[PDB]
Every structure is written in C-alpha cells, then in structure tokens.
C-alpha cells in the first residue's frame with residue numbers, strides 16, 4: 001500500500017517562527033529513508049510552496065486569515081490527489097492550522113472518515129473565543145459541522161466545508177483547555193480521554209474504548225492528527241506550546257502501534273515540530289527522533305521487533 | 315463555600331532552615347489570586363507569628379520541643395476557629411510537624427474526620443523510635459489514639475489530645491520507612507499503599523479502594539495532608555527529604571482531582587516546600603508551580619478543563 | 629539463607645571497555661556492607677581472575693570466542709560450587725555474555741530452574757544472525773535447547789550444554805530487537821512482555837502472569853538476570869546499549885520485590901553496568917545506586933520499610 005510524504009512548511013498559524021523548519025528537520029533525521037525500509041512503498045511529494053498574501057489584514061482578532069486560508073486550500077488540493085490514487089497521506093508540517101488542509105482534503109475522498117486528535121489542546125476555538133488570533137488552535141472549529149455559522153466567516157476560508165461531525169472524532173492527551181473550548185466540547189458532547197482519563201484507565205483501556213466508539217459500528221478510515229506537544233515536554237521539548245504532565249514516550253508508541261493494528265490509518269499529521277525552539281541541540285534531536293519514531297510506528301515498526309515474511313533466518 | 319489560607323512559616327521541626335519561606339514562595343507564585351479564580355471564596359488569613367521559646371532544651375532526643383509545641387498549639391487555635399465558621403482550611407507550611415496543629419484544630423470541629431496522608435514517609439516515629447530528635451517525622455505518633463502513652467509526655471505537647479485512630483487514616487506514596495515506623499503501622503494495622511501498591515493497582519484503583527475504606531461506611535470530612543516530597547524529586551526538587559521513585563505530577567494530580575469530586579475535603583496541608591534547597595531557580599519554580607497545581611486541583615480546576623455555569627460561550 | 633557475591637570483571641563481550649569496572653563500582657557504592665544489613669548471611673567471593681587467551685582470532689564474525697568461552701567456563705564452575713553448598717549466587721558483571729556461565733553454573737545444581745530475562749534486548753542472536761560479533765548479545769543463543777545445532781560450534785564453547793528450554797524463560801521490557809532475534813522468539817514462541825505489553829497491562833499484572841506461567845505448574849528456583857539497560861537511561865545511563873522508553877525505577881523495584889516475595893530466587897545477575905560511560909559522575913552515582921537499589925530488594929528490603937523480628941521498638 002502507498003504512502004505519500006507532503007511537507008507543509010507553514011507557520012502563520014502562530015506567533016513563533018521556526019516551525020516551517022520541521023519538514024527539513026524530520027527529513028534530515030532520516031524519515032523518508034527509514035520508511036522505505038518498511039513493508040510499504042514510499043513517494044515523497046516534496047515541500048509545498050505557500051504563496052504569501054500581501055496586506056493580510058487581521059479579521060478582527062484572527063491573524064493572517066487569507067494567508068492561512070490560502071495555504072490550507074493548497075494543502076487540501078494536494079491531499080485529495082494522493083488519497084484519490086489510493087495512497088496514505090503523511091503530512092509533515094508546521095503549526096496545526098494546516099490540519100484544515102489535511103483533514104478537509106481527506107474527507108473529499110473518504111467522507112466517512114473519523115479522527116483521533118492527539119494533542120494537549122483541543123486546538124478548537126472560534127474566531128469569537130480566541131484570546132489570541134492564532135489559528136493553529138482553532139483547526140477543529142472550522143471543520144465541525146455543528147459549528148457551522150457559530151462564528152463569522154473569515155477571509156480565506158470560504159472554500160472550507162465542515163467535513164466531520166462531533167461524533168466522528170476523539171481527543172487523546174488533553175490537559176490545557178481554555179474556558180471557551182471546554183464549553184464547546186461538553187455542549188457538543190465530544191468523546192475525549194484527557195490527562196485525568198489516561199491516568200484512571202491507562203493507555204491500554206483507552207484505545208480499546210476509542211476504537212469501539214469510533215469503529216464500534218462501522219469500519220471507516222482513520223485520520224490521525226498528532227501535535228508533538230501531545231507527549232510531555234521531556235520527550236518533545238521542541239514545540240511551541242509545551243505543557244507539563246503529558247503522554248509518555250511509551251503510551252505514544254502504544255497509540256501509534258494500535259492504530260497500525262486496525263489497518264485503517266488513512267491520514268496522518270505530524271504537526272508543530274519546531275527545531276529552533278530546542279534549548280539545546282539535544283532537545284531538538286530528542287523531539288525529532290521521537291517524532292520520527294511515532295511515524296514509523298503508525299507504519300508497522302513494533303517494539304517487540306519485526307522480520308521480513310518468507311525469510312527463513314536460520 | 316469558604317476557604318481560608320493560613321500561613322505557617324515554621325521550620326524548627328527539622329535541621330535544614332529554609333522551609334519557613336514556603337508560604338512566601340507559594341504566595342509569590344500567585345496562589346492566593348489563582349484561587350479566587352475558582353468557584354470559591356478566598357480570604358487570606360496571613361502568616362502566623364510563631365513565638366520562639368528561649369532555652370528550648372532538648373527532651374532526650376527530640377529537638378525544640380517547647381518551640382515546636384507552642385507553635386502548633388497556636389495553629390490548632392487558628393484552624394479550629396475558621397472550621398467553626400464553616401470554612402475549609404488550607405495551611406501553607408513549613409515542615410510537616412505543623413500538621414499536628416492543622417489536624418488537631420480540625421478534629422475539634424469535625425471529630426469524625428479522616429486523613430489521607432500523601433507523603434514519602436510515615437512521619438510516625440515516637441520520641442523513643444526516632445534516630446533524629448526531629449519532629450517533622452513524628453506528627454502522627456502524637457495524633458494516634460492507639461499511641462497515647464506509648465512514649466513520654468514531651469514539654470509543650472500537654473495540650474495535645476489524640477483525635478484520630480489508626481482506622482481513619484491511609485497513607486499514599488510510601489517509600490522511605492524506618493524499621494520502627496513499619497512496625498507500628500503493621501501492628502496497629504494502618505491502611506496504606508506503598509509505591510509498590512501504586513505500581514500494582516494503579517493510581518486509579520488505589521483511590522477507589524481508599525475511598526471505600528475511609529468512606530465505604532459513613533460520609534465524613536477529609537483532612538488532606540500533602541508532603542511535597544510525596545511526589546518524585548524530578549517534580550518536587552526543593553524539598554528537605556527527597557526520595558527517588560516517587561509519585562508523578564499526574565498521579566498527584568489524579569489524587570487531588572478525585573478528592574475534589576468527593577466534595578468532602580475539609581482540611582488541606584501543603585507542607586515541606588523549601589525555596590533555599592533548590593539547586594537552580596528552575597527547580598524552585600517547578601516544585602512551587604506543582605505545589606500550586608495541586609492546591610488548585612483540590613478546588614475544581616480540572617485538566618479536561620473548566621467553564622462557568624449559566625454562561626453560553628456561543 | 630546464604631548469599632555469595634561473585635565478581636566477574638569481564639568485558640570481551642563487546643567493543644566498549646569499562647564494564648569490567650562494574651563490580652569495583654558496585655562494591656564501592658557499598659553493596660556488600662548494605663546486604664549484611666538484611667536478614668541474610670553474606671560472603672563476598674572476591675573477583676575472578678580471567679586469563680586472556682593469546683591470539684583469540686575471530687570465529688567468522690564472532691569476536692573473542694576463546695576468551696569469552698574460557699571465562700564463562702570458569703564462572704560456571706564457581707557458580708555450580710556455591711549453589712552446591714546451598715547458597716544464593718549474586719553476580720556483579722561486566723557484559724552480559726557472562727550470563728552463560730552464571731545460568732550454566734546454576735542449572736547444574738538446579739536443572740529445573742527458570743529465568744526471568746529483564747533486559748531491553750533479547751540477547752538471543754546466533755553466530756549466524758549477529759550483525760556484530762558481540763557475544764554480550766547472544767548469551768541466550770548458547771543456552772537454549774531448541775537452538776542446539778542451529779549454528780556452528782564456536783571455539784571455547786564446547787563445554788556448554790543447553791540447560792533451559794524455550795519454556796522456562798521469560799523476558800521483561802524488550803524494546804530493541806533485531807529482525808533475526810524477533811523471528812527466533814516468535815518461532816520458538818517464547819513468553820515475553822515487550823514495553824508495549826507493560827504499557828497495556830501494567831507492572832502489576834505482568835508479574836502476576838509471568839509467575840503463573842513459570843510457576844503455575846511446579847515450584848522451582850528462580851534465576852534473575854538483570855541487564856541494567858533494561859530500565860530507561862534516565863535511571864541507568866552508565867550503560868553500553870541504552871535505549872529510550874525503558875522500565876521505570878519504580879517497575880524495576882516492583883519486579884525485584886515480587887521476586888523476593890516468591891522465596892524462590894536462586895541466581896541473580898547484575899550485568900553490563902559501565903562506570904566510564906556516564907557523561908557525568910552523577911550519572912555514574914545514579915546508575916550504580918540502582919544496580920544495588922534493585923539487588924538489596926531481591927533480598928527483602930521493602931519500600932514500605934522493614935523492621936527486625938522479635939524487637940519491640942516501644
């Protein structure tokens with residue numbers, strides 16, 4: 001089965017430059033070559049060139065609305081292109097705002113898709129709830145169907161159409177929620193397993209339930225959106241919004257391991273990896289190895305080990 | 315419901331000076347104002363002046379017995395006073411030996427109360443079993459009813475009256491216990507979950523069984539004494555007696571979260587946070603930041619998030 | 629209940645020097661003295677003088693076959709001697725390749741013994757499957773009954789007799805396995821708990837299932853081989869092949885505590901602790917402290933604490 005790497009060197013999703021350097025870091029560490037070693041076929045799409053919109057005046061509080069809006073539209077145009085030819089889409093980003101390109105492009109070809117959002121935030125505010133005009137923490141808002149019309153239209157997001165409903169997605173690793181956000185998720189009653197939950201049940205029971213909830217009834221493709229800030233700052237320090245007491249290195253692979261196991265992974269997002277934010281070359285090396293590591297896990301590489309079929313090693 | 319912050323800048327309890335700075339370290343970090351942000355009312359009682367006793371000769375091994383006694387007596391006098399006006403007490407200490415006063419004053423108004431001791435030690439040595447005349451490691455030996463008269467009367471501790479029995483207390487996070495201490499808890503049969511127990515059951519099940527143990531039969535107030543050294547040093551640096559293999563930030567959080575949920579916490583202790591014992595300013599910020607995290611957990615703040623009632627954020 | 633420490637300062641098991649200094653590291657940290665504080669009797673059998681074989685040409689890929697084979701032959705003979713007199717055999721190593729002598733000496737006197745292999749690796753390659761001629765990562769290949777005659781006879785290992793079968797052994801914390809290795813364990817179907825396992829069950833249930841799998845039917849002596857690298861480097865950094873995402877200082881103790889709990893320990897190995905590889909004295913002090921923390925545990929020392937029998941501390 002096909003795999004297509006699509007770099008998204010973008011960052012206007014937030015105030016700290018540097019995340020457009022993620023792709024270049026991930027590829028540098030050896031992601032593309034490490035993947036060709038798996039049972040899959042790998043075609044690297046290269047890095048998309050994001051045209052900058054001049055005079056991108058702020059829509060109320062939101063910053064860079066036409067820029068962010070334009071990039072994502074170019075992303076969702078690319079994604080549909082690989083998913084159309086039946087090939088799994090791995091997007092190497094920038095900030096999370098690129099999810100709107102990532103998941104909108106996915107749904108065009110697999111409208112019945114679900115989403116597992118591994119993040120420490122819901123990154124799902126509305127241009128009416130953000131205390132910051134930053135769109136990297138609003139990706140979901142623009143996606144949700146039940147959120148259509150619950151906030152103004154934002155210059156550059158006309159092309160967007162709510163693709164998934166509050167029933168088809170599940171958060172994992174939440175720990176920093178704004179009053180606003182907590183409201184929405186409760187009100188719309190979305191399924192999540194916040195830090196608290198993943199203390200009480202354990203990452204073992206948590207993927208068991210998230211699977212019966214999303215795949216309990218019908219079998220449908222999986223779109224995994226992984227904010228490196230999902231695991232703790234001791235495993236991913238090179239991120240813009242780090243937050244204490246997160247998901248261990250282990251539960252992370254566990255996650256990515258089980259998702260492989262479903263044979264249902266359709267879209268994968270490796271967002272917000274920032275090489276310039278590492279306090280030491282180590283932490284940058286740390287954040288990337290564990291970013292690559294999770295990316296190889298969603299594609300077979302197990303911790304008990306692997307071996308090539310039909311090969312008698314004796 | 316009322317909350318009353320009581321400043322206990324005491325340290326005589328032990329040899330390492332620096333703990334009487336705890337309050338000033340927790341207040342500085344924003345504890346007081348952080349709390350008024352919750353659904354509760356907050357009145358800061360201020361820091362109690364502790365009269366020093368001249369010529370506080372040592373009773374055999376014990377050190378500063380009269381000094382440590384009078385303070386506590388003035389602590390139970392302040393506590394009992396605010397609990398009388400139906401308000402929850404949060405004591406920012408010093409060394410733990412002040413618990414003596416926080417639990418003694420508490421029981422005068424709620425004599426049927428229980429105690430969830432989260433710490434790395436049992437601080438239950440008798441003036442006869444301590445290898446150090448230190449009182450921060452004995453607060454319990456004085457409170458226990460089954461321990462009345464199993465050791466000599468210590469000058470300054472005549473006013474004390476064992477308010478609780480070996481039945482109404484459970485320990486959490488035990489890992490450093492002295493031969494004498496383990497004996498006592500085995501003999502009197504106290505309910506505990508030593509780190510070994512938390513690895514076995516999970517911080518999930520553990521809180522499930524400690525609740526049905528202390529609250530399976532009758533519903534009573536919860537006095538929560540928390541020795542910062544309760545968690546591992548990696549999280550709680552700036553503590554006098556740090557001991558490897560401790561309770562994570564997450565577990566110490568899941569505990570406090572659940573103590574809220576009961577709606578039964580009555581008295582709270584935030585003991586042994588030492589500012590001067592931090593190897594770097596970071597480590598002083600850290601322990602503090604997470605001593606605060608917990609204090610704001612005991613009162614609502616959830617990781618999944620919080621939103622104000624009756625407010626429609628849409 | 630006899631204990632016999634046996635220093636095996638060997639290292640030819642791999643390319644990095646330093647491991648021979650292990651014993652002389654554990655010993656300084658005060659291992660022997662600390663053990664005498666337990667309920668056991670202690671006899672330190674000094675360190676073994678290992679004669680170096682001149683002109684130890686490489687058998688195909690394998691390196692130091694004759695020097696490694698001779699050393700172990702001399703270890704096994706020391707071992708089988710103190711097990712003979714009814715004493716427990718604790719071996720402070722070098723490189724793990726000395727397991728071969730440690731477990732070989734052990735099966736002579738207790739041919740019905742079991743082994744719990746706590747290590748980040750399976751150390752079970754064959755001279756035909758190694759990518760390196762390193763014997764520290766093959767010990768098991770020489771011990772297995774099912775592996776007899778699955779490779780060529782290696783110079784110096786003519787004295788070795790497969791003593792345990794695929795059935796009496798179990799791994800714990802595997803997270804780095806080469807293609808070959810995985811195959812083997814799969815094919816001979818060995819009972820293990822990779823890191824994924826420990827995540828999904830917990831160090832609680834894990835020991836429950838390893839005990840009922842190894843001791844469910846008959847009660848037999850337990851040989852515990854502990855590759856310090858089985859833990860996470862943050863706990864055991866001073867090691868030759870560290871690997872991210874290991875067991876916690878807490879599971880590590882949990883494990884050694886339950887093994888004490890059976891009353892069946894018989895043989896114990898504390899291999900591959902290398903003092904020269906700690907980036908800082910601290911990492912050397914750390915690692916060491918826990919190759920002992922763990923040992924003094926296999927002999928009782930409980931985190932809940934201990935107290936001497938018949939001694940009324942009141």
Ligand SMILES: [Mn+2]
Pocket residue numbers: 096119121123136137227272
């Ligand atoms: Mn995000």
Ligand SMILES: [Mn+2]
Pocket residue numbers: 119120121123227229241
């Ligand atoms: Mn995030």
Ligand SMILES: [Mn+2]
Pocket residue numbers: 433434435436437541543555
């Ligand atoms: Mn303590």
Ligand SMILES: [Mn+2]
Pocket residue numbers: 410433435437450541586
């Ligand atoms: Mn204490």
Ligand SMILES: [Mn+2]
Pocket residue numbers: 747748749751855857858869
């Ligand atoms: Mn190993």
Ligand SMILES: [Mn+2]
Pocket residue numbers: 724747749751764855900
């Ligand atoms: Mn090994």
